[PDB]
Ligand binder design. Structure first.
Ligand SMILES: CO[C@H]1O[C@H](CO)[C@@H](O)[C@H](O[C@H]2O[C@H](CO)[C@@H](O)[C@H](O)[C@@H]2O)[C@@H]1O
Ligand SMILES: CO[C@H]1O[C@H](CO)[C@@H](O)[C@H](O[C@H]2O[C@H](CO)[C@@H](O)[C@H](O)[C@@H]2O)[C@@H]1O
Ligand SMILES: *[C@@H]1O[C@H](CO)[C@@H](O)[C@H](O)[C@H]1NC(C)=O
Ligand SMILES: *[C@@H]1O[C@H](CO)[C@@H](O)[C@H](O)[C@H]1NC(C)=O
Ligand SMILES: [Ca+2]
Ligand SMILES: [Ca+2]
Ligand SMILES: [Mn+2]
Ligand SMILES: [Mn+2]
Lengths: 240, 240
């Protein structure tokens, strides 16, 4: 597999190329609802939901030293009745058999396990998070404000940019990886043009195995919010 | 909504290919569809096929959408025979398509003998590169080597005369334009010799909404290797 690209303008309830994990569901409105809701559609506590595209991505090839670029465009919105809505949605890359880690329903966003969430040598996850909950005595790894973060085998982001949550408002996001500069880029924009940028230098060949899957994860612990992905398009090309 | 992938060559640890029958990846990273012996010599009575694992949304009734697609591939054939058989085809079929019974020969791994010329029993769209045409056996063929477009029948809706070139790679582009409902084929040899064949066909009447795409080849009493060097594919669903 030298390249893979796909696009979801919206989500089909009869979608064939998605792996749904945990509470992830596609609504009759063609929205992917990651975290669980009750019978009235209200977000609930202690829920994790993830999707992965079924086709695997060859992110790099050790035997010829090729490394893939990639680009992921998506838009999402969050809804909650709470003052401190939690926990956040993330675009992430992980090994093809990745499953929801134990104890990940909360600040670990469905991506990490508590005893190893800050130990990079125990993880294989590259993620772009949209973190809404940052209480310093529980989400201790976080900056003390909502943020967009790039996670490199740790729930403690290698870099963050301050971010404003907007109840029910769609955020459009472009994540790009340039192999030649080993730069992972993140641009996020609200409908009014309000923008957020963040980037890090990361060598994916030391962070992830050669074959990966790509997708999204969201979680709520004691505090909750819905995490609604509306669209997603991805592209990756393996290059010398 | 859309999908694209490419194989510059074939990885022996591929994850997104469904192989059927005798298809395998060689040490040169070539997809060898039909069976070969231990010296790489073609053998009788063999079918091999591959399908990309991710399913293609070829059309959607409820939104009156039909997808375009393009398939770019290079293959070469080798045989010691003066009448080498039977051919390779790019094809599209329902997602659970399996090698039909009796299809190791002129049916190209695509059709079953009883139903091979009965469009009412088949769900196959294919572009075939047919090297064997003996009129008392492959009665459905024209009496010469040919490239043909097959619509639910081994009897091509249209063919163009073609020349087989031993061991030479043929470059093929197949495109489907849903606004003109035209499937066309441009095949080119390295010296520039070109072949053109096209058919007005409405995919919504020949194939289900969800399909898989790939290749098939076969040999019956006569034989040849059917070697796929590369394949790139893209498909986008558009309003019609
Ligand atoms: C109001 O709940 C906060 O305080 C509780 C007790 O001090 C914590 O248990 C709780 O943490 C859990 O929920 C948060 C928010 O969903 C989550 O980030 C964390 O991982 C725990 O699951 C929260 O801090
Ligand atoms: C030399 O074999 C030819 O004549 C034989 C006797 O009539 C046929 O059996 C034979 O047909 C089978 O092989 C061909 C070539 O591989 C294939 O096209 C056909 O489907 C049969 O499997 C061939 O015509
Ligand atoms: C980090 O994880 C590694 C194994 O992946 C382990 O050997 C090490 O003890 C861990 N370090 C800490 C501080 O937990
Ligand atoms: C053609 O196929 C259809 C559907 O399988 C079947 O009903 C019909 O009897 C066939 N006609 C023939 C055998 O010519
Ligand atoms: Ca957090
Ligand atoms: Ca034939
Ligand atoms: Mn964070
Ligand atoms: Mn033919």
């Amino acid at each position: 597999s030298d390249s893979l690209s796909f696009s979801f303008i919206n989500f089909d309830q009869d979608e064939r190329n998605v792996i749904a994990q945990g509470d992830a569901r596609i609504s009759g409105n063609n929205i992917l609802q990651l975290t669980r809701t009750d019978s009235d559609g209200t977000p609930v506590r202690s829920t994790v939901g993830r999707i992965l595209y079924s086709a695997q991505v060859r992110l790099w090839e050790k035997s010829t030293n090729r490394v893939a670029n990639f680009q992921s465009q998506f838009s999402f919105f969050l809804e909650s009745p709470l003052s401190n809505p939690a926990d956040g949605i993330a675009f992430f890359i992980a090994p093809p058999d990745t499953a929801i880690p134990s104890g990940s329903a909360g600040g670990l966003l469905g991506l990490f396990s508590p005893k190893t969430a800050q130990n990079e040598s125990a993880n294989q996850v590259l993620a772009v998070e949209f973190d809404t909950f940052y209480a310093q005595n529980s989400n201790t790894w976080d900056p003390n404000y909502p943020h967009i973060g790039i996670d490199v085998n740790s729930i403690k982001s290698a870099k963050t940019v301050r971010w404003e949550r907007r109840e029910g408002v769609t955020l459009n996001v472009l994540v790009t990886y340039n192999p030649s500069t080993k730069t992972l880029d993140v641009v996020a924009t609200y409908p009014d043009g309000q923008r957020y940028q963040i980037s890090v230098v990361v060598d994916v060949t030391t962070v992830l195995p050669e074959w990966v899957r790509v997708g999204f994860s969201a979680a709520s612990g004691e505090q909750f919010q819905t995490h609604n992905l509306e669209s997603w398009s991805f592209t990756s090309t393996l290059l010398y």
